[PDB]
Amino acid sequence: NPTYFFTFGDAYSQTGFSASGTQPSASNPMGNPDLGIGTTTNGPNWIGYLTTTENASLVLSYNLAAGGATIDNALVPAYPGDLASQFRLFEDVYADKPASAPWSAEDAVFGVWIGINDIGNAYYSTDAETYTPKLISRLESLVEEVYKNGGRKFLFLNVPPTSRSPLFLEQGEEVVKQHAEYLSVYNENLEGMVDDFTKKKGDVTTVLYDSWSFMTKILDDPTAYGFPDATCINDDGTSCIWWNNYHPGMKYHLLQAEDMKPKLRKLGGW
Numbered sequence: 001n002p003t004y005f006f007t008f009g010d011a012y013s014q015t016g017f018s019a020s021g022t023q024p025s026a027s028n029p030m031g032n033p034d035l036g037i038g039t040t041t042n043g044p045n046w047i048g049y050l051t052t053t054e055n056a057s058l059v060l061s062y063n064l065a066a067g068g069a070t071i072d073n074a075l076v077p078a079y080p081g082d083l084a085s086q087f088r089l090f091e092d093v094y095a096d097k098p099a100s101a102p103w104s105a106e107d108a109v110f111g112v113w114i115g116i117n118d119i120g121n122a123y124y125s126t127d128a129e130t131y132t133p134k135l136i137s138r139l140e141s142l143v144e145e146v147y148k149n150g151g152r153k154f155l156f157l158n159v160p161p162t163s164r165s166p167l168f169l170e171q172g173e174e175v176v177k178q179h180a181e182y183l184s185v186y187n188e189n190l191e192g193m194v195d196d197f198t199k200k201k202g203d204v205t206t207v208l209y210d211s212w213s214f215m216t217k218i219l220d221d222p223t224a225y226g227f228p229d230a231t232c233i234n235d236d237g238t239s240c241i242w243w244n245n246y247h248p249g250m251k252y253h254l255l256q257a258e259d260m261k262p263k264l265r266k267l268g269g270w
Contacts, residue, residue: 002058003269004107005047005061005111005269006062006064006094006103007111007113008086008110009083009086009114010065010067010116010117011066011067011068012040012113012160012248013047013063014039014040014063014065014067015039015047015048015065016037017062019064019089021033023101024060024101029052029055029058029060029061030061031061031062036048039253040067040247041237041250042238042249046257046260047061047063049253049258050260050270053254054257054270056269057268058269062101064089066079066081066085070082070083075138076117076121076126078121083112083142087145087146095146095149108153109153110155111154111155115158115159115190116162119159119186123179123183124178124179129185136186136189137193140193143197147201147204153204153205153206154194154207155264156194158190158208160212160214164180165242165245190208194208195208209264214255214259215256218241227239227251228240233245234249237251
């Protein structure tokens, strides 16, 4: 009946879900905390909207994303809850298909949105062309853990244009440009990995969602989407693209979830 939606990522995805908090159910698909709590948006984020607003059938959200996460602290380090640690939490609690989340290959979707903080911390100190393959390869080996558990449906979001967040705009247009060039190489290598994984496994269902082009379209013509400009900040999450200087608000996240829905039909919950 349900789609079990396990997500992994950083503060663009965090909701504050605890593996010991109330677990997801049909009456409470997010589990914990309440829908709209725990995000960097002032309200629901893209996962809350995909689970409760844009869903075509019952989706249960197990959201392991943690703020500030990089892929693996052995590569670009930041916070303890890196992506590797999120996969370890999955291994510890959900990989064995417990009664609270008795998932199978046909009804589990694994969504990963990572790379914002790897790029944000490493864009001027590392070489994109040789370093981002190392980041992407570690992402692939983490995915491989879930593949060996039996997972077969995967959603990857590429990195949005955080180069044009207020946090980077204030550092100067040349810094925006340097970050954006690094980010573009990361996203190219992400696409190559997802394509190669899909073809080599042969039994997976995958979606690569181009969040970069979507958010860029909004930033390039903000008033067409109800925003006064591409640079203002408002903690209401709706008057501006940006909720704070580095994270977009709930209105942006809703627009993204609505854009995602038709692309996610093949994954079973949309």
